[PDB]
Amino acid sequence: PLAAYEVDDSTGYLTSDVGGPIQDQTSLKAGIRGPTLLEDFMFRQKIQHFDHERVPERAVHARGAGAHGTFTSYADWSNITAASFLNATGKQTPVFVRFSTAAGSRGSADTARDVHGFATRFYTDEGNFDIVGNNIPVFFIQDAIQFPDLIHSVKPRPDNEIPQAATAHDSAWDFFSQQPSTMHTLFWAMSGHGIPRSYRHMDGFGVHTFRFVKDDGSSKLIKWHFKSRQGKASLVWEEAQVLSGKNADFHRQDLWDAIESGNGPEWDVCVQIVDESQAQAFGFDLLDPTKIIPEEYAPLTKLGLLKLDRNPTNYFAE
Amino acid sequence: SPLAAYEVDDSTGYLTSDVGGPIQDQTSLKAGIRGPTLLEDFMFRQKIQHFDHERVPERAVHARGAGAHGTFTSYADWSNITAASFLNATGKQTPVFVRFSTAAGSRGSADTARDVHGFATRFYTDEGNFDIVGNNIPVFFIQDAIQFPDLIHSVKPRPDNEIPQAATAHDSAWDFFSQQPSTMHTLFWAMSGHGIPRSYRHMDGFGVHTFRFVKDDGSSKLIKWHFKSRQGKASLVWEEAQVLSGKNADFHRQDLWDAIESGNGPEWDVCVQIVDESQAQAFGFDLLDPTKIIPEEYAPLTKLGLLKLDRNPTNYFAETEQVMFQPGHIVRGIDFTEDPLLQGRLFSYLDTQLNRNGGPNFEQLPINMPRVPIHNNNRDGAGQMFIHRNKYPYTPNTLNSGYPRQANQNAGRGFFTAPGRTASGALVREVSPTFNDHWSQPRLFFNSLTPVEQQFLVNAMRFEISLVKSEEVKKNVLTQLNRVSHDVAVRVAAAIGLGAPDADDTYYHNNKTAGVSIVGSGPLPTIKTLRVGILATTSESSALDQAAQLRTRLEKDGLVVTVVAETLREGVDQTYSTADATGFDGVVVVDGAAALFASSPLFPTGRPLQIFVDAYRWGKPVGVCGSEVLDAADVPEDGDGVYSEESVDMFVEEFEKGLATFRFTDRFALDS
Amino acid sequence: SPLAAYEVDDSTGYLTSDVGGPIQDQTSLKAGIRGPTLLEDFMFRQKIQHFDHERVPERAVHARGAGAHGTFTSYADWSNITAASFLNATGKQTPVFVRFSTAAGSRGSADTARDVHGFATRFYTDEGNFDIVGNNIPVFFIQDAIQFPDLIHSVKPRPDNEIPQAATAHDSAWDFFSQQPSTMHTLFWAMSGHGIPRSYRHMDGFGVHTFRFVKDDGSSKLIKWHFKSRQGKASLVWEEAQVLSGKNADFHRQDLWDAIESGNGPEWDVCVQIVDESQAQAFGFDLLDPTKIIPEEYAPLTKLGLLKLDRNPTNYFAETEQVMFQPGHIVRGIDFTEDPLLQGRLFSYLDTQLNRNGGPNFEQLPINMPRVPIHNNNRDGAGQMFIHRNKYPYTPNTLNSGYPRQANQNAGRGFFTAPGRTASGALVREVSPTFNDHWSQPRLFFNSLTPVEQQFLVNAMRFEISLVKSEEVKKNVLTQLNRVSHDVAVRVAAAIGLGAPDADDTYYHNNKTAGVSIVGSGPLPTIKTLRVGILATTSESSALDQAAQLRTRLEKDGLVVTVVAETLREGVDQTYSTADATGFDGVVVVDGAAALFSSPLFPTGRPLQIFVDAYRWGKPVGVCGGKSSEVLDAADVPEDGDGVYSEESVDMFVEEFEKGLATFRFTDRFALDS
Numbered sequence A: 001p002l003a004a005y006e007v008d009d010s011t012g013y014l015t016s017d018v019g020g021p022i023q024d025q026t027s028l029k030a031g032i033r034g035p036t037l038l039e040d041f042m043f044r045q046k047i048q049h050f051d052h053e054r055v056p057e058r059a060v061h062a063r064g065a066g067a068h069g070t071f072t073s074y075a076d077w078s079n080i081t082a083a084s085f086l087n088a089t090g091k092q093t094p095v096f097v098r099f100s101t102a103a104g105s106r107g108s109a110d111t112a113r114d115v116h117g118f119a120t121r122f123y124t125d126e127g128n129f130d131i132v133g134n135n136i137p138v139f140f141i142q143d144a145i146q147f148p149d150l151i152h153s154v155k156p157r158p159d160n161e162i163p164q165a166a167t168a169h170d171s172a173w174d175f176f177s178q179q180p181s182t183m184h185t186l187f188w189a190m191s192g193h194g195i196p197r198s199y200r201h202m203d204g205f206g207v208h209t210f211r212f213v214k215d216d217g218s219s220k221l222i223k224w225h226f227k228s229r230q231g232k233a234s235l236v237w238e239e240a241q242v243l244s245g246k247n248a249d250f251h252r253q254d255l256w257d258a259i260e261s262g263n264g265p266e267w268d269v270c271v272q273i274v275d276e277s278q279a280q281a282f283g284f285d286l287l288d289p290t291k292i293i294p295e296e297y298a299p300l301t302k303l304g305l306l307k308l309d310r311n312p313t314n315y316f317a318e
Numbered sequence B: 001s002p003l004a005a006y007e008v009d010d011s012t013g014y015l016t017s018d019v020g021g022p023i024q025d026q027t028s029l030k031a032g033i034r035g036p037t038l039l040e041d042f043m044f045r046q047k048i049q050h051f052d053h054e055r056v057p058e059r060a061v062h063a064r065g066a067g068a069h070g071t072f073t074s075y076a077d078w079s080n081i082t083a084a085s086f087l088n089a090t091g092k093q094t095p096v097f098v099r100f101s102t103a104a105g106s107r108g109s110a111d112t113a114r115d116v117h118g119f120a121t122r123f124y125t126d127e128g129n130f131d132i133v134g135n136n137i138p139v140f141f142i143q144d145a146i147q148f149p150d151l152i153h154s155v156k157p158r159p160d161n162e163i164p165q166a167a168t169a170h171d172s173a174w175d176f177f178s179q180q181p182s183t184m185h186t187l188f189w190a191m192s193g194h195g196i197p198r199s200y201r202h203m204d205g206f207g208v209h210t211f212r213f214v215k216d217d218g219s220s221k222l223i224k225w226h227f228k229s230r231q232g233k234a235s236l237v238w239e240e241a242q243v244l245s246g247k248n249a250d251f252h253r254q255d256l257w258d259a260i261e262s263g264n265g266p267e268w269d270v271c272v273q274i275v276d277e278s279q280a281q282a283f284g285f286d287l288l289d290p291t292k293i294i295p296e297e298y299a300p301l302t303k304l305g306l307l308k309l310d311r312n313p314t315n316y317f318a319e320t321e322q323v324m325f326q327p328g329h330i331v332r333g334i335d336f337t338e339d340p341l342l343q344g345r346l347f348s349y350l351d352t353q354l355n356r357n358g359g360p361n362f363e364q365l366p367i368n369m370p371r372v373p374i375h376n377n378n379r380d381g382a383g384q385m386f387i388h389r390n391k392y393p394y395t396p397n398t399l400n401s402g403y404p405r406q407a408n409q410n411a412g413r414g415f416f417t418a419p420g421r422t423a424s425g426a427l428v429r430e431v432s433p434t435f436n437d438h439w440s441q442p443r444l445f446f447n448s449l450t451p452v453e454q455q456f457l458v459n460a461m462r463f464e465i466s467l468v469k470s471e472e473v474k475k476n477v478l479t480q481l482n483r484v485s486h487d488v489a490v491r492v493a494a495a496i497g498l499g500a501p502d503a504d505d506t507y508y509h510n511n512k513t514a515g516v517s518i519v520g521s522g523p524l525p526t527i528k529t530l531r532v533g534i535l536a537t538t539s540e541s542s543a544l545d546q547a548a549q550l551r552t553r554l555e556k557d558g559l560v561v562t563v564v565a566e567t568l569r570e571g572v573d574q575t576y577s578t579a580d581a582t583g584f585d586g587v588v589v590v591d592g593a594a595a596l597f598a599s600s601p602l603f604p605t606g607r608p609l610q611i612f613v614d615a616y617r618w619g620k621p622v623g624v625c626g627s628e629v630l631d632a633a634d635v636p637e638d639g640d641g642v643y644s645e646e647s648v649d650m651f652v653e654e655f656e657k658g659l660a661t662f663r664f665t666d667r668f669a670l671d672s
Numbered sequence C: 001s002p003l004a005a006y007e008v009d010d011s012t013g014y015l016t017s018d019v020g021g022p023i024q025d026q027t028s029l030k031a032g033i034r035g036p037t038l039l040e041d042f043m044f045r046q047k048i049q050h051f052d053h054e055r056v057p058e059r060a061v062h063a064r065g066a067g068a069h070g071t072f073t074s075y076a077d078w079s080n081i082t083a084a085s086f087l088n089a090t091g092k093q094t095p096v097f098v099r100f101s102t103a104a105g106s107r108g109s110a111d112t113a114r115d116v117h118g119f120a121t122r123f124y125t126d127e128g129n130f131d132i133v134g135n136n137i138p139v140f141f142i143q144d145a146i147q148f149p150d151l152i153h154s155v156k157p158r159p160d161n162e163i164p165q166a167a168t169a170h171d172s173a174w175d176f177f178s179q180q181p182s183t184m185h186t187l188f189w190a191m192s193g194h195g196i197p198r199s200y201r202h203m204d205g206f207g208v209h210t211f212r213f214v215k216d217d218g219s220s221k222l223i224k225w226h227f228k229s230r231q232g233k234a235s236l237v238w239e240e241a242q243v244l245s246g247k248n249a250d251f252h253r254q255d256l257w258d259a260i261e262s263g264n265g266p267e268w269d270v271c272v273q274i275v276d277e278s279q280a281q282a283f284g285f286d287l288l289d290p291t292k293i294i295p296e297e298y299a300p301l302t303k304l305g306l307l308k309l310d311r312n313p314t315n316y317f318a319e320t321e322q323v324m325f326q327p328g329h330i331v332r333g334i335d336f337t338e339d340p341l342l343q344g345r346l347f348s349y350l351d352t353q354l355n356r357n358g359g360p361n362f363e364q365l366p367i368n369m370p371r372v373p374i375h376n377n378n379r380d381g382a383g384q385m386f387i388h389r390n391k392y393p394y395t396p397n398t399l400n401s402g403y404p405r406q407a408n409q410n411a412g413r414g415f416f417t418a419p420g421r422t423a424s425g426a427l428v429r430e431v432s433p434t435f436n437d438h439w440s441q442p443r444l445f446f447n448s449l450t451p452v453e454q455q456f457l458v459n460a461m462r463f464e465i466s467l468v469k470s471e472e473v474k475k476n477v478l479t480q481l482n483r484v485s486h487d488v489a490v491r492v493a494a495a496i497g498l499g500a501p502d503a504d505d506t507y508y509h510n511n512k513t514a515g516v517s518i519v520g521s522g523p524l525p526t527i528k529t530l531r532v533g534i535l536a537t538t539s540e541s542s543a544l545d546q547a548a549q550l551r552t553r554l555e556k557d558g559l560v561v562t563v564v565a566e567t568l569r570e571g572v573d574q575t576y577s578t579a580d581a582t583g584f585d586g587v588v589v590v591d592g593a594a595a596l597f598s599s600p601l602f603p604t605g606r607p608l609q610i611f612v613d614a615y616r617w618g619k620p621v622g623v624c625g626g627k628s629s630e631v632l633d634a635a636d637v638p639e640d641g642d643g644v645y646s647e648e649s650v651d652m653f654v655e656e657f658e659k660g661l662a663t664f665r666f667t668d669r670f671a672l673d674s
């Protein structure tokens, strides 16, 4: 899939980045017990590379894991959307998905209590389409300008950077109690949804109302819902705590293993579809990201199958 | 102090942009009440752009850590051994900043991972910043800096899946250790209690490399830095460290924060072993080799001064995250040696700050600034915070009267390379044959540990090596362990189902050395800061009375007391639900609570008992104050570090001796 | 000095590292006296690393430029029209920093390129930094911010070979201009003397866009900023600008530096045209359209205050290179309009500083810092210089007692959007048909130039279009020019050997507007700082005596005198070898030197060439001492010509010559199309 960019090092002699054969095990010195020389370019190119390996972690959802897969459309959905990846029964589009926690840094534990990310890229034949979702259908806040306030409050206190990957501290609850919009996502996070058994055992939600637009220009309002075929399942809190200690890599290992063993996880990619006229018909505003549309009011339509079946080759690059 | 000058107070006043315009930051500007957000909303974009760019790359190693401010005080005028100004007078005080860390884990990984630990100290001296970038272990894995990315790639997570976090417990790490025998000495240290210290305060710091002290007359001697903890030496046990990682990833940084906040700032004696240049190869090994210690029997310690950390940072990102240490930050009176590990570090720490800071002016960050004037011809660069008045920044000049002037051995107190240093021979990429003994000092270390300490180390290796999938790597590992000790290889082999290779006694010996054992280092010199968990109940008013009485007594002796019960109320600090044995150095049950130890929606099933049981199994002093509890917990009444008294005063007295002893090691099973 | 706190003195002391350790920096540490350099040489590496990383990206546009500090002083309490604090009291003073620039060229390109010029002003107000990011031309090429990269790609060098530097005289630029007719108005400005100003001090500044002034009671009015120069309007002629680019690439920055250093800091009246919201479409065009000016006949200027630049920077990189302007630096009392060019700029200037500074904390650079306290919850980021005490940086909070408090119209003097502003209609990527007339205003401009000024413009177009290789592009250019003026198309067509298309009179008219002509703007109101070259000789002690007397008399009136001779000595400033007519506003030969007009000391014919060039470029020229016909005849300069002087008396010579410096250019020396 990304075959063209792969580099193989199963044979051959060590070279610099400009293809000159070299060694990299001993520094060049003025005498066998002497000082290292500035002219040692082998040393400097290798160490400069190493010194510069790291990039900033993501400002949120720093901790996560991904895989490649395929999306297959169940129908020609031309009658609700012009979207090319949805325009024929059986049409296949490559995907890449990254799942994550939200608050913790790189290296924090998979099984912390948190909102989880479920970000999906469809490499469509009319361009990349991303649905950047969470495992919880609603968000804490109603205006993007408040994001840094929310995130500062739930991340570690800035004098001592304590506590890692946890809402269990004064600042977060101060924010929650002063900003009552947070109540809905709070209740989800405090349920089993905050500690899922695996990435495969949770759903994905776009959260926002988006629009499907036909080629004739007519539109409908939609909510994205990726429905897990593995079922839903959570940990219990005491278990999640011990797991955070025994295996910080629990979720990424789970996903990696299911893929290697030929049990790639699957989701039905679904939408709730409603009319433009129904923006305020359900007793709340569809522009409000703290609300769900009860399934009693709008059933889910299954658009296609998302299957993840191939692990990355290099975690950093992918 | 450059840091007071840059403090920003936000305890009053109206919100402003970064250019001082009063603004709001709670609602986006929209076209209509239910409309799209406008591009012209500058309040939105300035706030979100800032947030979007908050993060910087983590350190390439030692990314997880924590820092504090303090003072170094010289005990003497040390001009007789070094020209260093911060050491030139009795009582001379120099501000310091120290950052402690693990090594392998990323910035959100647990403090209590098994690992080498950093101990980096900046002395803001009156003749420039001097950094000693050390570890809690005196020897390093490799003999040449060029091998550093090999070491780090092998111990960091596997690069296809980025598993496992902050752990040597995987194939690649043990493959490297078994193929690169220089690693044995540091590996032995890391597999001991030194890999899982009780806190940053209960470990020592080592410069690792031999350095030089250089006098004003040009003569030099060879030195090793050793920062000796005044708090004593102490470790976790492994199963405790694992539980801690889950229950409190921030255990060490919290321990340091709290000790400082309560007026119990940690202290070290800053010491050196000092030997003559002629002794570079006198001790049976090469002092240029960073995998070797100078046994204290060959060179005793000289105490130079006191290091005390006593002030927490105000902003962690600005101070702790941005501090940028360099062994290149050196001062007159100190010089480098030809240690090929040290040699290469000099390059790496200057270069890597470019990655972290994103520009060349990183020394202008308040935490990195010196406490003396700067005079040089460095100019421009992204993030230039100075306005230079000298418009002729080249040497030699007449247009600025020849300023700044050259400093050297004979002018302006300049740094100078030790004038006795020479080089000779071919320009070679060759390892000195004097470096070849990779196994005798690992054996020296192992020999110096107590029997239960040796068992803990064997058990660490059993744990990790049992997780290595490759049969080939496991066998290669036993080959190397066997060159250190046949007994180690036998005992480790037993757990992984392979046979050890035949004894190979080339490097075996029975010699020991002082000061490397934790268990054999004696009771702790103080118990201030140590944590006592008092397990109580809300259902008995007697239980809460006893708790309160203990608290008064224990708190007066500097101990941190946590009363635990089913729910919070006056006098109760923590519910059973959030409590765990890893949160205490000692655990006391007030006997009025016996009922809990025999179901509640308020805590998981059997929680009160489990805490007591874990505390016992992990070797902690445990007690009952008011003994069927001990039956329920299967704890022997007569056991060492088990207490049972109705006398408040008698119990406190005995239990406080238990906290000093710290661990009761007789509770751990030993190989035959 | 505004930034004193950040200054670093190196007039004494021993060399140190950046961490204060005394060091040397003159010899590398080596293994032996003829040995290899050692990696442990930290003195070498810290010094060379710094050097290796000195450069930052130049500005994507306006890369070439120069800055200075000054003061703005309000003429009144302007609360009747704006809430702006910096305008709230008579005599109220605010520090400023201004940077001037060309637009297309890179760093190191020449000041005297033909171009639009930047005029960017920061007011460090007591209610925050307020920037007016303007140009010396009142209209812009394009009507929507989204087209900016198309414009800039077209006028910058061709991307295969990066040719030509700092010039519109190539196919791609004229291709864009001819396909995008909105460009015509600014093009006509740039092809006039406004494209080649005599100095930064002799040009005006324009905000270009309509902005709003907003009162504390929330009512608003539409405004245009006009900074009117107190030095007068003046231009180079093209041939002169070309030679200048090669003889002194730094001409404008030197001129500004020198004027400030001599206590002649330049001044502008900071003015606005003010009109009601109801007049957005009352003047025959849309006030949201940045290709249109409001003629002065429809809206006169209000003088708000005085701008004076009077202090040069200390370190150019730290102040001038690092200053980061944004139209997003706005203050209470001012607001935006729905000009789609302005709207997009708001985005660009915040984003582009990330590129230049390499990190998000660019507002912390001394030159970008405000002069009032900052209270917000912005945190971290590379290069973070603050240590924030508030450990609860979120709103809403109780743990920091609700601080910082929200500022808005009612509390804390907050910025607020003019509350009368609305939007209505479909969400569209459509151009308003009110923007559709691209040609009437260029014609209004052209009509307002004097005959010789119109010739200069036609000649600029003939120069550049002649260098366009594509006959199709050239034909498309004539199509657009012809929509502005048939006469212009005909006269330009003549130089390039094409025929003009037939007259198309849809947008022709004969209307004129005041205040846009340079050549018609009258004699300069001051001649201080103008440059007089006295050409002399060392052969005659009398030539040097005349030169000294003349110097004394001219310097008394604040002119900058340069005595030129074969070689330097006391009283001679420059040799003929380095001298050029482009270095002077006026040229005087002392009659003692008549014989000069071959030496190893200067190129053949140089002294004469300086005089002749000065004459051909319209400058006042003369001979002092009484004997003039030898010089004037050798030069082919008629003795009775306007702006040609000859007197024995120093005092009398200078009085006549000084009138000529004020007139500045003698335009009768240039041929007109017949």
Ligand code: HDD
Pocket: A058, A059, A060, A061, A064, A098, A099, A100, A116, A117, A118, A119, A132, A133, A134, A139, A143, A144, A145, A147, A205, A206, A207, A208, A289, B048, B052
């Ligand atoms: C205005 C700021 C803002 C707001 C209101 C949100 N986010 Fe976000 N999000 C970011 C700003 C951001 C970001 C800072 O831009 C990140 C960090 C790294 C990145 O690529 O974008 C990000 C990362 C990020 C990731 C990690 C993607 C990956 O794996 O690389 C996920 C899954 C989400 N977000 C999902 C959400 C959901 C479901 C939201 C509520 C509906 C949401 N975000 C609101």
Ligand code: HDD
Pocket: A047, A051, B059, B060, B061, B062, B065, B099, B100, B101, B117, B118, B119, B120, B133, B134, B135, B140, B144, B145, B146, B148, B207, B208, B209, B290, B323, B324, B325, B341, B344, B345, B348, B349, B352, B353
């Ligand atoms: C040639 C590469 C190289 C080698 C051989 C070493 N290191 Fe290192 N070290 C680095 C390259 C490096 C680095 C990549 O340059 C770091 C990462 C971030 C930084 O500032 O420097 C660093 C970070 C770093 C830190 C964190 C400092 C802080 O708290 O910010 C400590 C304590 C050490 N190292 C200590 C050591 C010790 C005791 C070594 C062996 C004697 C050692 N390093 C060998």
Ligand code: HDD
Pocket: C059, C060, C061, C062, C065, C099, C100, C101, C117, C118, C119, C120, C133, C134, C135, C140, C144, C145, C146, C148, C207, C208, C209, C290, C323, C324, C325, C341, C344, C345, C348, C349, C352, C353
């Ligand atoms: C949307 C893109 C865009 C548009 C439509 C414009 N500009 Fe701009 N301008 C920039 C994008 C930009 C920029 C890329 O963001 C620059 C480069 C460096 C900087 O700070 O902003 C810039 C630089 C810049 C400078 C140099 C400021 C300094 O000295 O540092 C001036 C004077 C202007 N511009 C003036 C204008 C005027 C009068 C315009 C029309 C009314 C205009 N710009 C339209």
Ligand SMILES: [Ca+2]
Pocket: A157, A169, A170, A171, A172
């Ligand atoms: Ca908190």
Ligand SMILES: [Ca+2]
Pocket: B158, B170, B171, B172, B173
């Ligand atoms: Ca591995």
Ligand SMILES: [Ca+2]
Pocket: C158, C170, C171, C172, C173
């Ligand atoms: Ca071209």
